Amino acid sequence: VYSYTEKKRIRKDFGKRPQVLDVPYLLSIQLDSFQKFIEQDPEGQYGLEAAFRSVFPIQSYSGNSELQYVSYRLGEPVFDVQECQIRGVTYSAPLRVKLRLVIYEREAPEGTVKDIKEQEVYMGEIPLMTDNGTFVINGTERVIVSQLHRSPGVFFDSDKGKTHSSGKVLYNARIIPYRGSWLDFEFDPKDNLFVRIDRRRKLPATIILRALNYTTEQILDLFFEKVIFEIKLQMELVPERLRGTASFDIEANGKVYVEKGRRITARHIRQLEKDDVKLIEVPVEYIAGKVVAKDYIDESTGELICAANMELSLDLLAKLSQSGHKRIETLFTNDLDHGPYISETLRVDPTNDRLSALVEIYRMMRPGEPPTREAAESLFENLFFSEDRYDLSAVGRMKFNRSLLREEIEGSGILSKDDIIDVMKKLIDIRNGKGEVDDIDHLGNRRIRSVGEMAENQFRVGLVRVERAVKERLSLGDLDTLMPQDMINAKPISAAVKEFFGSSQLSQFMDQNNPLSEITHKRRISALGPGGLTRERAGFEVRDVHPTHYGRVCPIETPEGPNIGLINSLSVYAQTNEYGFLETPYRKVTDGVVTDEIHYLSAIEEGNYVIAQANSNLDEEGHFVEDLVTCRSKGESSLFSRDQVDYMDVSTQQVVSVGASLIPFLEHDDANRALMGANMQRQAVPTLRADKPLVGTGMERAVAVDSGVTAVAKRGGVVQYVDASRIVIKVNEDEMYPGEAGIDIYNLTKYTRSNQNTCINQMPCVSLGEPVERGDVLADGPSTDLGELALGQNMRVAFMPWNGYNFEDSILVSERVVQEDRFTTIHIQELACVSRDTKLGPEEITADIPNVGEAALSKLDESGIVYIGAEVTGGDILVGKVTPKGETQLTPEEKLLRAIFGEKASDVKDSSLRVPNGVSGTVIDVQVFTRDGVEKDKRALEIEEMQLKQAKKDLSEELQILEAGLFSRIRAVLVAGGVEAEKLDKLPRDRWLELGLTDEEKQNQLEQLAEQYDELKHEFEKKLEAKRRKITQGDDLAPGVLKIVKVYLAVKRRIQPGDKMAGRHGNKGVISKINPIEDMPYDENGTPVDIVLNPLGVPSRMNIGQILETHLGMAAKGIGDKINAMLKQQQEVAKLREFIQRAYDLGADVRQKVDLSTFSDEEVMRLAENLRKGMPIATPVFDGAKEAEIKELLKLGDLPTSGQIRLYDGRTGEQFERPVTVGYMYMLKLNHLVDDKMHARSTGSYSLVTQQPLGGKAQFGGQRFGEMEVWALEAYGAAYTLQEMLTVKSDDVNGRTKMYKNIVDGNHQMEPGMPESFNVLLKEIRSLGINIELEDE
């Protein structure tokens, strides 16, 4: 079953592997995020509800009064998107929150309240997102790109034997909160743990434990195990403890268990456990090196014999034995594994009590202040453990609990003693060899934040500032009759939002070269921005491509330049989890059968499975064919038995991005060239007429439709009306929504300017009475053809040298390509003329200008503004304006000249707007904005009247077409239940609503209610009319400007030498010549070649996908030329049905099956007229067409299977030797035009302080001559050239006018003088205390 828009032209599809999952909406990363921000969530956890609940309520001193938050809402935007763009104002909605001030009186604080005041306060405007994922900020369309940042949580990393001459590995551990401070636990080269609080000075780890009300006994109990001793001098033995090099081998039961000297082995432990050894006797010296566990005191005098954590010696043992101590405790510590790192920390601990620890922390954080017990306790308790100042988000708790192997995902956002102790234990275990560190590049440790989250984080910031201000306000007075409106000023809250959306690193102008640039800009991931990395400190560790990028981030598409690998593109099927982690779909495999249910796996969740490759042959019932199947396990890939796989890739495209999946035969191109090809394909300029690709990959339709450049049908129906500007669809009865009229209107966007000054134009692709369905394209946008993306043109290309005109990467083009307007583009630019009020008087816009001799005043109308439709050229006047100048002071010869001729001073300037030199287009639009107090000259009134008429006509046409649909539907309903057919039409149209129906009395009351509802609708439309006549309101022009006139010029640029062309395989070049058509090479039939390419560029640049594309394009065009012949020899459908079915059935086990026996004859002939310029072909990215299939398709047409024909020289008619490769290739016209890049300057304007030529083309600046060019001139002897480049040509002020006068006198000599970069230097040095002077000759 084929779609209506896709049965007009079916693209032949190679691609043997079947599709299980269809490509997703390509703009769901942007549209899901902002819906979660601006939306109402009862259980407030998303968006504005979360921020309001996190800040409010606000409590003042003593809880005398409270300010509670109830709800919020967004108002309707005053201006819609189009009016926001025309008027140059942000498209936003106002945020209104209903707060409630409650006041507590004396006596019982927690009881009756005096009074509650409920009020809605307006607190800023939040920009709204268009239905295409963009914002309008100042009339310009913006994109806010996502950000890949490191997730909050616990990350254990090391130094990998670096920064250590010894080569030892120092391990660390960092807690990173969503907002808060950064705790840490690192190892000193002496094996001692030191916590660093906020990048401050490190201190021993145990300090913090003592700050958490821990004693030494408790610390040892938590970190170390215990070895007991009894007093003769017997010790309990655990067989596992003495694993093993022992001072005393054993003495159990006296007789024997193992001799001395020999290390204890496994068999010794086996014998001891079998014999049940529980108590042993050992020599006293063995305990000479141990450490006592707990404090042991003497009962004779109550003295401390020995404290905890003290080395135990023989004298201490004797004292304890003679003091009556039998049970003596010690601590375990095998240096190999359970080594001692806490003991040393305690011994080097400068603390004994909590208060000293708090004082030390106070000094470290804010040194020099008098420490105080209460102050220090408050500082520590607020640093962490405080909900306000430290948040470990829901993602942070999950990545923290999971890192420490806990069973709870949910938790608290603040730290606790358990969490810190567990982090310490994990780091110690890592230092003991148990466990591994983390990779900070793994996409399981990196999170994505998108617009809704970043925007809510900036709204929360503003809310915090306002909450502090409100708390301060209620800190004093707390008077009654204070409504919650004087406390809340909107500017602080709106500042954060406006600054984020307007001037931010991740908010940037949208790319509108073509649909592909927009789509690829919207689904872009950036590692830069606030809270992210920076270019200088990035290093190549995070610029590499990781194994976990597979299926989530494209490895190919990335910019080449200062930030390569820092900006990536989301892969085709990649999506984000509830926590912000990229995940990708896999098709689940049961015991043997590859099911059709997809699981979305995350980077870490995917490590512990075995996932088969998409190019893995499957049987008809889902079983793997081959005994061994290649799959990728944890980190690497290898063969696995068919019976031990559990997932499979969902497609062969799922690794690449949308841009890189549009390159056919990507497998045959070198990766560098694929990168270049994607980047260049993003830069193509749409042309006058669009041309589908003859060789595509099948992703064109998805990109075209999921972009919004096209008009897609919301509901099915029949095309009631079509026009170059609108489409009216009469919906099917099945989807009517009984309250509706039944028709929907699509208004096409005609010639309009994009951010790159190109043209945006939609044209219909349907006809009257043409059945449409939902999802069918109704109007092609720019660079789309029948719903398919079309970025370039199909050019007939030959690979051969041809006389040095394609020498490096130059391209030779025919004049027939320039005659047929294949690469002609439309560029729209806007110019502005502002009339300000100066100090000498206001400026005026007039058609009467001084010193202009009526030559350039013809196009202007009586108001001083050019007519719409005029063909202007460089130097013409568009808006005529004059500026009041005063005084003059005429020289002695300019006075005599004025006398002889009696000509007086103009007293006004000629500061009029004129076409920039070199431009030539037609004026397609003029718009005038005037202040409130200005007079609205005649042209402005004309434009206002035209706008009012157009708005009234459009609104009335809408209403009357809707009325026509309503009456037609009512007539259709009236065919039954009291039907009048012949008498129905006799009565007038207005008497349709009063037509009767079945008899009753309740029906009459409903009739009257319906009449009242209709009159109310009439009044509604009347008030809408009144509102629209009201946008005749003055404009909010900046201060000092009286009016602004904007003119729109539509230039039509043709192709010429110096323009840049490219294919899809990273093969770019510059046109070098436009060659007559009699001079191009031609074949035996007399058809010339459109373009001649150089073969020498293919071998070195191993991108041989262009040769295969050329061969397959030749095959497709051959199929197209055999249908043109049958349709021109007027042959029967039976013959066209047979051939068109032999070409759609060619292939080797292809997945597509087109049956042209279900097609009508009117449909076989509409397809054959769309395939008469070439049959389209699809070659998926890694599932393309085999060369054998290309040969077979060439043979289906009558072309040689070699792909090479014999050509003749157009100049001489002699055939070239060794036949050459000709075919059809898809060429793009990149947006690097030689018109925009040619610049020459002789003399112009100069800078104010450094009087040097200005810089640029607008400023008409000069060329920068720097050090490496100075060295080049010094390497020659060119001393005069250097001197004139440094002084007379740049900033020798009085030596540059003398040079000009000398040149116009035919005397080529200079008087250099001294640069003004040296005079300024002398003045600046002298304005210090230094005295630098030029010494006399």
């Binding site: 490096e808 900046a1038 030498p1057 510059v1070 040619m1238 001559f1265 080529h1308």
Partner: protein, 251 residues
């Protein structure tokens, strides 16, 4: 300087000077009130700080900031740095009589000749055209000549072809890595907007024809023209200065 809309732009030195003057005046006024010595000592410390911020900002203190949070630029900051006068301007400044464009092949050219767009040459050689028009009587005065070239009359093209006859132009490509990155050529006026470059010179410039651009400068003085013709001409430089091997080999 006043800007459009009533806004003003100012240099950061005005802020520093105003600071110094305010604190100096306050100190002078405070000395005449016989204030307690704590106040005068503090005022003198402030004056010292202000003068040191003027001469060299943030050298011993932390910094001083203006309306923004950026540090103010001081007298020392205008000479030193990588943007200071003693660096940037003084060997890396913008130049008149120059322009850039895109380069194409032009395989018909001789090694001493380059193709130059006629429009780029009507601008670079404008004063020469005015002079040669006024010298042949075509234009009575220089304003007349300016309107003749502006209208692009027919005689102007012949005068331009006469001016360009033997007058080299220096062509330079972006990274000048050795002295063969600037070379002198005789122009040949062509249609279009792209420069044509002799193929055998590409190896010297490390230039290809996939979007590269070149800058063109015109020598003005007699000595500069002679140096271009005798020192920098492309037909004088066919050996590599690194090794005597030819650098003009077919590619």
């Amino acid at each position: 300087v006043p800007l459009d809309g009533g806004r003003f732009a100012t240099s950061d030195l005005n802020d520093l000077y105003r600071r110094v003057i305010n604190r100096n005046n306050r100190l002078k006024r405070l000395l005449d009130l016989a204030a307690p010595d704590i106040i005068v000592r503090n005022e003198k410390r402030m004056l010292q700080e202000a003068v040191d911020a003027l001469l060299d900002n943030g050298r011993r203190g932390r910094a001083i900031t203006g309306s923004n949070k950026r540090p103010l630029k001081s007298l020392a900051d205008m000479i030193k740095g990588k943007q200071g006068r003693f660096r940037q301007n003084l060997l890396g400044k913008r130049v008149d009589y120059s322009g850039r464009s895109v380069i194409t092949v032009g395989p018909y050219l001789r090694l001493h000749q380059c193709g130059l767009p006629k429009k780029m040459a009507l601008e670079l050689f404008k004063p020469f055209i005015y002079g040669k028009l006024e010298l042949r009587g075509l234009a009575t005065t220089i304003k007349a000549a300016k309107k003749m070239v502006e209208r692009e009359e027919a005689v102007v093209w012949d005068i331009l072809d006469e001016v360009i006859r033997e007058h080299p132009v220096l062509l330079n490509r972006a990274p000048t890595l050795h002295r063969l990155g600037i070379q002198a050529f005789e122009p040949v006026l062509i249609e279009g907007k792209a420069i044509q470059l002799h193929p055998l010179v590409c190896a010297a410039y490390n230039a290809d024809f996939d979007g590269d651009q070149m800058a063109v400068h015109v020598p003005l003085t007699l000595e500069a023209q002679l140096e271009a013709r005798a020192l920098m001409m492309s037909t004088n430089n066919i050996l590599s200065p690194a090794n005597g091997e030819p650098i003009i080999v077919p590619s």
